[PDB]
Design a protein around this ligand. Structure first.
Ligand SMILES: CC[C@H]1OC(=O)[C@H](C)[C@@H](O[C@H]2C[C@@](C)(OC)[C@@H](O)[C@H](C)O2)[C@H](C)[C@@H](O[C@@H]2O[C@H](C)C[C@H](N(C)C)[C@H]2O)[C@](C)(O)C[C@@H](C)C(=O)[C@H](C)[C@@H](O)[C@]1(C)O
Lengths: 46, 7, 271
RNA sequence: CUUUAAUGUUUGAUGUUCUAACGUUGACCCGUAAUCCGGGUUGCGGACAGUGUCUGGUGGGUAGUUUGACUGGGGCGGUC
RNA sequence: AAUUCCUUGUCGGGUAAGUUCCGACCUGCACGAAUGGCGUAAUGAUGGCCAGGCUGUCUCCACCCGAGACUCAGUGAAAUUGAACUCGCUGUGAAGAUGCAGUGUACCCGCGGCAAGACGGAAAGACCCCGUGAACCUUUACUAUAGCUUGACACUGAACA
RNA sequence: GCUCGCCGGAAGACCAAGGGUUCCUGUCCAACGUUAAUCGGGGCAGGGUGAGUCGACCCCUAAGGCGAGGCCGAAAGGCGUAGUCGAUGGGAAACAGGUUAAUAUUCCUGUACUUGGUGUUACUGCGAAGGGGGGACGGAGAAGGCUAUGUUGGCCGGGCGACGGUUGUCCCGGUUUAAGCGUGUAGGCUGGUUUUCCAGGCAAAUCCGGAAAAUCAAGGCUGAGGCGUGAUGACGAGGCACUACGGUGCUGAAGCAACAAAUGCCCUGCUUCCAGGAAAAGCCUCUAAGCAUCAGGUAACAUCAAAUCGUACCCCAAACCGACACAGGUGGUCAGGUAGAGAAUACCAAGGCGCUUGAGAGAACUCGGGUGAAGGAACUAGGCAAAAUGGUGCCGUAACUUCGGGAGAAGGCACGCUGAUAUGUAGGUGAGGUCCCUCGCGGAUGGAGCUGAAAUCAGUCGAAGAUACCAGCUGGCUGCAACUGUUUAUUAAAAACACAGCACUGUGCAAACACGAAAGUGGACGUAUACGGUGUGACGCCUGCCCGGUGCCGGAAGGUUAAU
RNA sequence: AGGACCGAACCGACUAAUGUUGAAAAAUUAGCGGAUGACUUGUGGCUGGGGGUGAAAGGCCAAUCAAACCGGGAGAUAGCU
């Protein structure tokens, strides 16, 4: 049957990508936390 | 147990 | 011409269409169209804010001159058109200066008749005029409320307004609602009743007829649980509440008009 | 140095009139090739409307809670 | 009767025989007129009842063809499990015993079969109650409150009566 | 390699999405593969993605997003103008063939085209972020014209048959060919041309729009396909070579006609209907400021530019979503023969597969199928399941009915094959020949050739001719719900929800009402024949009494009553 | 002409058996409903947690729903085991 993950990069980037993340005070805090955590992929982009 | 049983 | 349908299927059995033969078959006057694009009853917040709205056919917007400024110049009504955006029909017009416009379509309409606006202008169906200059008792349709503003009263199929008096700088009108409202007299007001009238008599006949006019189903209060709506739960029908809107204010008689800014203008409310 | 009453006031209640705060989701003008905003002229409305503080009413629309114990299971009854 | 407790009410019909069904009666425990009454052609993977056809549904099961089950070769799981040298009966016993008493029976060990028992496995019961437990829902429970509404003062002025 | 079997509206073929080297070649078999494994989508190494024309980038915008200023908000922020982004839609242009182990409309051969720059030569009013035109649009239906495509004959090449026959009215195979350029057809739409004038198109306009006349009517767009050319080209049955036995070279016949024929194209057409059917740019035209020898504009020829990024492979799946090499889910494209109404179904072609444990046994039981004496629902909660019905034509068909229905009610009869009517008919198609002519892809007449149902009569085989596959069971009484529809993704599809119809009630527009501290937005670019809310639920006949309670509407008196 | 009829694709999910450490955390097989419409479908957009959406089942809001998930208050409190 049709399951929950129906991949699509356009939507991926638009919803979770760097710039999207960057477009909101909290989206930025998202990055900030991940940087402080020393994460190797801030936001799974190209 | 349920609840199905008886009762 | 109102016409029953033969029951070659349930949900035609009951249908009753209005067929207007003298209505322009074919495409409308292109340069008086702009896209309309549907609302889905939704806010600029994305929040359904008027329920029961969705789908329906596509609908391009006809412009329609409500103000009626082209005073002096006369025009001729080329043809009568169907408008999806309203109950009434519209008449493509053509003033002598070569300009085309969209008027409503008073009961007389009929291609070839001659229209004109302004303080001069024949008292005759279709001609717009300050009520300053329309004889008390006329049956004047699409009426302005603020002089020069637009025309906002009696625009629906078959509607009309009756000028009953005019002391001072003011006129008192008899709105179809039966209200008695004063209006500034300097207000434009096109002459006669508006068309279709028969519009009233269609019967639609099936579910789809509603859906494809962009109306979505209405789900009764008491068909839902307590959390959804003040009505019902009950283990079997049940009610036992004074009826209310899904936000708790009573329907069935509670007036809900509160203005004051505009009470000066209402002479006598309807019943 | 007045009640049976009335001219000058400082002051409430009501009714008319005015424009000058205030409204304008009328019209026109400019910023400006701009259905936002602002400025301007003007018509309409006009000390109303609206708003702030205070205040009586209404208020399951929304929230937090309470709704006893005994008991030959518990409830109902009875008891305290 | 989607409403009738008493109830398989009573009468009529259908059956050899009918607590259902069809038609009636009215004694409606406890129908009733837009939380609509009574009807209704057509429609319905809708509920109840009947008949023809049909038959392995049944009397009552037989044979056959294929896929497993069985044997060999290769690969190779699972839940459960205090420890096991893990029989029957009658009785005792935290009250339904493989394990206590008494007694009967039984050479040691597989493989294929079957599920009567291990109060078999699986989920720290939902029913039951209990906790000065939780949550959502209700209202003429209590206390508040957004909203709606009332007046006063401010923004707020001038006249004449 | 030879048989055998399975899919063939797929289990074949091309992609998008998604994956991201899974592609190809060597090499290895530990781990991965539900077994072995010499094999692999597995390890290691090397190779492989070639574009002015396909696509992205790009121009253009829809929904919607962002948003200088701005309005609003304790802060964070919210909304929105000018704009600026955003394809799921619009926008210039390449085709047939060949070649790589692996890409190719990208490389090669043949043959083309698009738009700009520059130059030459002619000829000319050029010119906007502006006006107008166009682009530009729905559903259903109806045929006609036509292609793909098929069938047969002719043509070409090959065959003379492992077993009676096959020199023939016999067998097998092939018979394919593009863009481009020329032609402008079936057929669609539309009266042209000139002069003058004008409150419109924010300014301007010669354009569009409007008003007059004036004169010929045949002018103009649009346009499948065919035909010519492209093409002495290519492809090509089949041949001969060699091959390291996978393949690889070379050579090369005919290449016509008739009939049938789409759901494709003509057709963004035509007819009709109501529910009334994006936007913007490219393109065309118009002028303003502006330039007037200039610059620009138009044409012919010549030449130069067209970057960058994608291009392997899987793509109804072992490569994507499902933790798996998982009986599931996954949008678009193509579509042959025989029978058939058919994209159903059965058997095949092209092509692709036999599903990554097998080998034997022929027990109980379980799963899935086949047949069954006599009986025929006795089974059971219940005919659950099985069984039966099943096509086409004609005959024929009850209550009731909203006059449509009920109806495929029910129930009958025929059905194959052969001959004849008729060496092949009714019909369809249609070349010659003759006349006509604005000579054409015209028209009229013309009937060869081709194609070819159904009927009847006569005869004939089987137990059986709708012979397989495929393919309604029917009727009677009754509750409920009018009906099509919707629902508890994953124990409830119903009598529940919805529905059209009905009623009450609110709402005069800065509407009621809803989201929102607010700005604002929806309601609606609507306006009482409208909109919200509530109940009821097609239709038919109808809907009685009670306002004491609770609520709502009205009520300028009086009693009680807040801040002050 | 039709929320018209029979019936594939496509969309549904009425019955049964199988399966229940599945082939599958809802399917398979045989039957079944709709199939020009309130139809069905690809791409992209908007709606946010006492909030959304809901032809209404307390349905759905990523295998989670009478108040989603992640982190925090946090070692909530637990007269109970
Ligand atoms: C398919 C697969 C599932 O099986 C079924 O669902 C069967 C059909 C249920 O019966 C179904 C059907 C039925 C009839 O039970 C037989 C019904 O009464 C119950 C409630 O659910 C069972 C057995 C239920 O047990 C029963 O639950 C009762 C509370 C008590 C009973 N016990 C006293 C013996 C107990 O065995 C229960 C809870 O699901 C078992 C727990 C452990 C599980 O959740 C496990 C994971 C099951 O879901 C399952 C095995 O995976």
């Amino acid at each position: 049957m049709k399951r929950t993950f129906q991949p699509s990069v356009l939507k991926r980037n638009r919803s979770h990508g760097f710039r999207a993340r960057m477009a909101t005070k909290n989206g930025r805090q998202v990055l900030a936390r991940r940087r402080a955590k020393g994460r190797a992929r801030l936001t799974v982009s190209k | 147990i349920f609840s199905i049983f008886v009762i | 011409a109102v016409v029953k349908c033969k029951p070659t299927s349930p949900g035609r059995r009951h249908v009753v269409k209005v067929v207007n033969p003298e209505l322009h078959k074919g495409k409308p006057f292109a340069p008086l169209l702009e896209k309309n694009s549907k609302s889905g009853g939704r806010n600029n917040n994305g929040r359904i804010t008027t329920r029961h709205i969705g789908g329906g056919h596509k609908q391009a917007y006809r412009i329609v001159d409500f103000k009626r400024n082209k005073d002096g110049i006369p025009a001729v009504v080329e043809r009568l058109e169907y408008d999806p955006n309203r109950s009434a029909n519209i008449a493509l017009v053509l003033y002598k200066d070569g300009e085309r416009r969209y008027i409503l379509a008073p009961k007389g309409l009929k291609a070839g008749d001659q229209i004109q606006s302004g303080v001069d202008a024949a008292i005759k169906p279709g001609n717009t005029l300050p009520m300053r200059n329309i004889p008390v008792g006329s049956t004047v349709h699409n009426v302005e409320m603020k002089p020069g503003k637009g025309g906002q009263l009696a625009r629906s199929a078959g509607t009309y307004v009756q000028i009953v008096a005019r002391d001072g700088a003011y006129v008192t009108l008899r709105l179809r609602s039966g209200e008695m409202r004063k209006v500034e007299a300097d207000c434009r007001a096109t002459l006669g009743e508006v068309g279709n009238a028969e519009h009233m008599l269609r019967v639609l006949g099936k579910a789809g007829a509603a859906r494809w006019r962009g109306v979505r189903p209405t789900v009764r209060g008491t068909a839902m649980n307590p959390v959804d709506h003040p009505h019902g739960g009950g283990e079997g029908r049940n009610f036992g509440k004074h009826p209310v809107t899904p936000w708790g204010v009573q329907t069935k008689g509670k007036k809900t008009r509160s203005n004051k800014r505009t009470d000066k203008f209402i002479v006598r409310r309807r019943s």
